[PDB]
Amino acid sequence: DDESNAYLGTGWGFPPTFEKKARSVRLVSAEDDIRESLQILLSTNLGERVMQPNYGCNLQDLLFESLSPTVASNIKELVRTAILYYEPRIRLNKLDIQQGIVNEADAQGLIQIIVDCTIISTNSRFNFVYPFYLQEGS
Amino acid sequence: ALTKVKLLAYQDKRFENKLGEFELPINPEQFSQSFKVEYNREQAQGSQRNDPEFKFTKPEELKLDFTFDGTGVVPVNNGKPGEFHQDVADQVRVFLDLVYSMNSETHKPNFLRLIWGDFSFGEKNGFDCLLTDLQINYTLFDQTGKPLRAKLSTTFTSYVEQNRRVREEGKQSPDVTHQRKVKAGDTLPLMTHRIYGDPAYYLQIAKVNGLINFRKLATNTDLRFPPLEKTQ
Amino acid sequence: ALTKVKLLAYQDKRFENKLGEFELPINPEQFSQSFKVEYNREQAQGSQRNDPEFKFTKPEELKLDFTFDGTGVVPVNNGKPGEFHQDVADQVRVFLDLVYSMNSETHKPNFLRLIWGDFSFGEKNGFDCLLTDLQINYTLFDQTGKPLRAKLSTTFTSYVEQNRRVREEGKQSPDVTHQRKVKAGDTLPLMTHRIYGDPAYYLQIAKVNGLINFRKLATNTDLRFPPLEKTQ
Amino acid sequence: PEELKLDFTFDGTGVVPVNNGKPGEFHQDVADQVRVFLDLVYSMNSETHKPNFLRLIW
Amino acid sequence: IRTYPPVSFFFEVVFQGENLDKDVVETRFQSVTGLSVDMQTETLKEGGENRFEHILPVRTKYDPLVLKRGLVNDSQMVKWCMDAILNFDIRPMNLLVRLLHIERSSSTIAPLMTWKVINAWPKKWSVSEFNAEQNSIAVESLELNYSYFETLK
Amino acid sequence: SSVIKPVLKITNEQQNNLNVHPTGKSINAIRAFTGKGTLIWGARTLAGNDNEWRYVSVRRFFNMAEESIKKGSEPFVFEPNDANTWTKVKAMIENFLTLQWRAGALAGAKPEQAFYVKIGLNETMTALDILEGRMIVEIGMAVVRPAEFIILKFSHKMQ
């Protein structure tokens, strides 16, 4: 079998869902397999994986601060580095960060970050999808 | 609000373990940045002009000048009334300890990141670097010998790790797999030329996708283009 | 109407697949172009003066300086009232992405073409080139750190493909066939000298054209002059 | 061998007269002059495969 | 055919701007000057021609525009200037300069000459010296940059 | 963008009667070309035989310019009807048109060859209009037009 987008891969969804009438576990693919990937990467801190001390992103280190220019640049650097190292399947376009605006008192306390990405039409040497990576290389 | 230049000092070559930061008391008036590319320039005999070949891109260079002043006429940006800068030696000390001296655990100077608020160097908001040149001039002194003004000139060079460099060069070549959709006006040899640079591979592509008649294509077909074999 | 300088970016070395274009917001005041030829200058001992031999012609060089300004006093040439240039970083970004960074499919920077309206460099209306040198100076900043003025200096070198270079040098030599008409005053040895540089070949030419008496020629005869044999 | 150095100017804004005797005539075309100059002194000759020999006279 | 030349002391200035064209105190000035243009050239010598040299045109330069009034303590124009000067926020404007006369066919006040001044923005602002021993008026002076001026033909 | 194809294929013989027709009701074709894709091929209005309103871009340019001049003129309503206002209105309109000339929308080597503006007593207005509160301005403009056809010709010299 060779379908469309097979080179992008399929995998487990997040969070894990188990069905009982259909005796199976939920599996995602293509673009959904990528979006969910991002949700994991930006919600894990750097020391939380057992033998992978470099996987994660320390965003909560920037809580309890006002959104000055020196904070926005730090957020951007962290997010860009994490995506560069751990998301080879996409291309990042821009990062939009805003504070404020709902109650104009509750709105003051939240920060909003928008991530814009596109999907590359070629494969990548850093993509561990089977069985292409046994030949595509590293 | 006025924003100030900051220098962040790291121990990790992946820029994850921050050691410290230094903030300039007076922003520089200007700075400069330099780029260069290297080509091969050999020429054939009795030939008019040439078509040079690419060799590599060199690291970028950065030049900066600034000043420390402690005579009591430059205000301190902290909001208190009646406050002016009056200590040069402390600033020189922390600066030299942060950017120049050897680290006792790594046996070399620290990795630096330069940030100025909303400034952008390019596709990034900071400059990752190492210090290569520094000069200090002391021009005004107190009656006990302690300095009142210092002028500094610095030269930095660009730094980026191996693992990250090969990922920034996302080399796409006939070393990977391609996928293309057929639209109105497409023909197989022209698509093959546009991917491989040579139409002659068309007969192979038709076999990979199971095409009985390859001179009349349908307009919603997705075709796969495999990589080439590593050595022929 | 005021015309602006344009830089066209191509991926193909034959300049057929256009990738993009960049337009300058302010035209340069001047630019310069440089040429050179190379000769052999060895001399015999005890000789007065010399007659040098030709070796080759070198690629041409081009120098350019220009400015980006975003303080709101330079109008935008779009016809709307009240519009002035106010964004330097965006322009620096698109410029560097177009002319400097590596292409992910070719693994090198793009090919460039420079065009200014009705300007002519010579026998052509554009300059085909590659970037070799670039410097940027930031001289004015906003209170948040974002720049308000940038000055750029660039150096380009000339580029032209092999296949096309040998066609521009339309080498005519005794390696091709010639044809000449006989007019009043012509004689065979003089025509032979004017084509081959040596009258001695005249007896061969008469045999190629079937001339019984070659000392009295008619004035509408078309004569063929074959090339010489490749190695003697 | 001896060396020779020369500098000169082409101007086409319409204030330098043309030395042909007609009233109201001024130089107004730079590109044509650059073209003929470069073709005469710089480009390769298709029959000799090199630039031409020059003679300077004043 | 003219027999008598015009007079210089009857004139007016109009700001075609934010809303300053309807404010009466913004048209009354004690003095206006600076309306002059100059062509800058270079000199080229030709060998063999010893009777004259060639003068070649290079660029065009304009003088700043200078206005003088008695001090007005609350002016929208001065707010515009001080916004440009203190907060580095400039917004150029267009101006008209008029020379006036009396026409009759009873009589009426009408423009005689008009110049358009394009893209003006603040250059300098000053107030005269305060002196305890002199009879004088507080006089303020404004100087402006602009691109060029033209005749409203 | 995001187009697979057109449902019909339109030929040369069929387009011949679509953009030029005795009724003037031109229809603009969408066509596909080899190696190029799907393009819009034609820019005429439903008055395609008219000497002035044949093209879409000229009509839309006139709409834009008229609306911008109207918005520029609005601040002069309720003022006195005399020469001191006519000069201001004239200056405003001429400045707008000069900006339009620099961008390349108007033809001509000099601004005087691209447009004209006129306003005055016994030129555009009579005494009665002035007494009734009316003010009249005359404007003329030369706009650039697009090209649909390219013709090649070859010449030969003997040498």
Side-chain angles (χ1 to χ4, degrees), chain B residues 11-194:
Chain B
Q11 189 172 350
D12 200 9
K13 82 177 181 186
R14 294 185 66 176
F15 287 81
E16 300 181 359
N17 181 18
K18 184 196 279 186
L19 294 179
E21 64 148 277
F22 181 74
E23 185 176 1
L24 261 59
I26 302 163
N27 286 331
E29 182 206 340
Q30 57 183 8
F31 65 90
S32 67
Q33 190 177 3
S34 178
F35 312 81
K36 186 170 180 181
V37 187
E38 293 279 351
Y39 290 91
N40 186 350
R41 301 193 177 202
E42 259 148 30
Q43 227 179 311
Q45 328 209 36
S47 62
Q48 180 180 359
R49 305 182 184 93
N50 189 26
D51 53 353
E53 295 185 341
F54 171 74
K55 289 198 293 192
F56 50 77
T57 302
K58 306 188 82 169
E60 306 162 6
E61 302 294 329
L62 187 70
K63 299 279 184 67
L64 177 63
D65 289 345
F66 52 107
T67 299
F68 297 159
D69 189 39
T71 63
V73 302
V74 177
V76 181
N77 202 22
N78 59 5
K80 331 274 183 60
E83 281 245 39
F84 300 88
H85 280 291
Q86 288 174 47
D87 199 301
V88 170
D90 263 347
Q91 288 163 345
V92 174
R93 191 178 309 177
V94 287
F95 179 79
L96 281 180
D97 203 66
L98 200 66
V99 308
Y100 174 71
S101 323
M102 180 184 280
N103 189 316
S104 63
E105 319 193 352
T106 69
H107 317 308
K108 62 179 182 60
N110 293 325
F111 291 98
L112 304 169
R113 178 172 281 162
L114 206 145
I115 296 171
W116 191 355
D118 272 352
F119 188 86
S120 178
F121 289 83
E123 63 185 342
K124 307 204 260 283
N125 276 108
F127 195 76
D128 291 323
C129 53
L130 298 162
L131 175 79
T132 80
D133 279 309
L134 169 69
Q135 179 172 307
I136 307 174
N137 287 97
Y138 298 99
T139 58
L140 199 76
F141 303 88
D142 186 18
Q143 81 181 1
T144 38
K146 291 174 65 175
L148 297 174
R149 185 159 296 156
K151 301 174 184 177
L152 301 93
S153 322
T154 65
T155 309
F156 296 92
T157 189
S158 181
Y159 181 89
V160 57
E161 91 180 26
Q162 180 181 0
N163 297 355
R164 184 171 180 157
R165 180 177 61 76
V166 299
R167 282 174 156 82
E168 285 172 349
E169 319 161 24
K171 292 166 136 40
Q172 297 164 6
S173 34
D175 313 327
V176 277
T177 302
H178 303 259
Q179 176 173 301
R180 295 289 176 274
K181 185 182 290 297
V182 178
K183 297 182 181 180
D186 282 332
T187 70
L188 184 62
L190 194 54
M191 300 173 86
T192 304
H193 172 259
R194 279 174 173 169

Side-chain angles (χ1 to χ4, degrees), chain A residues 57-86:
Chain A
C57 187
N58 293 337
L59 288 177
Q60 73 170 68
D61 278 28
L62 297 169
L63 292 175
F64 301 102
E65 290 187 333
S66 298
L67 189 65
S68 73
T70 309
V71 176
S73 320
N74 293 336
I75 293 169
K76 291 176 186 177
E77 292 299 308
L78 287 174
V79 174
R80 284 170 182 151
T81 302
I83 293 171
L84 177 66
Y85 273 109
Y86 295 108

Side-chain angles (χ1 to χ4, degrees), chain A residues 90-111:
Chain A
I90 64 167
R91 186 184 75 205
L92 179 65
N93 294 329
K94 183 178 179 180
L95 301 175
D96 178 5
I97 306 169
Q98 297 177 41
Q99 179 171 3
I101 212 59
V102 201
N103 284 166
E104 300 208 270
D106 281 342
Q108 288 170 336
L110 58 78
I111 308 180

Side-chain angles (χ1 to χ4, degrees), chain F residues 100-114:
Chain F
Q100 294 302 308
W101 170 74
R102 276 197 184 89
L106 303 180
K110 296 183 180 178
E112 308 87 280
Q113 295 173 308

Side-chain angles (χ1 to χ4, degrees), chain B residues 1 3 29-33 35 37 39 43 46-52 57 116-119 170-172, chain C residues 55-57 60 100 104-105 107 132 134-139 141 143-146 159-160 162 165 169:
Chain B
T3 315
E29 182 206 340
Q30 57 183 8
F31 65 90
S32 67
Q33 190 177 3
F35 312 81
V37 187
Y39 290 91
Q43 227 179 311
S47 62
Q48 180 180 359
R49 305 182 184 93
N50 189 26
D51 53 353
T57 302
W116 191 355
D118 272 352
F119 188 86
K171 292 166 136 40
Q172 297 164 6
Chain C
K55 289 198 293 192
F56 50 76
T57 302
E60 306 162 6
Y100 174 71
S104 63
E105 319 193 352
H107 317 308
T132 80
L134 168 69
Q135 179 172 307
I136 307 174
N137 287 97
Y138 298 99
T139 57
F141 303 88
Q143 81 181 1
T144 38
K146 291 174 65 175
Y159 181 89
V160 57
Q162 180 181 0
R165 180 177 61 76
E169 319 161 24

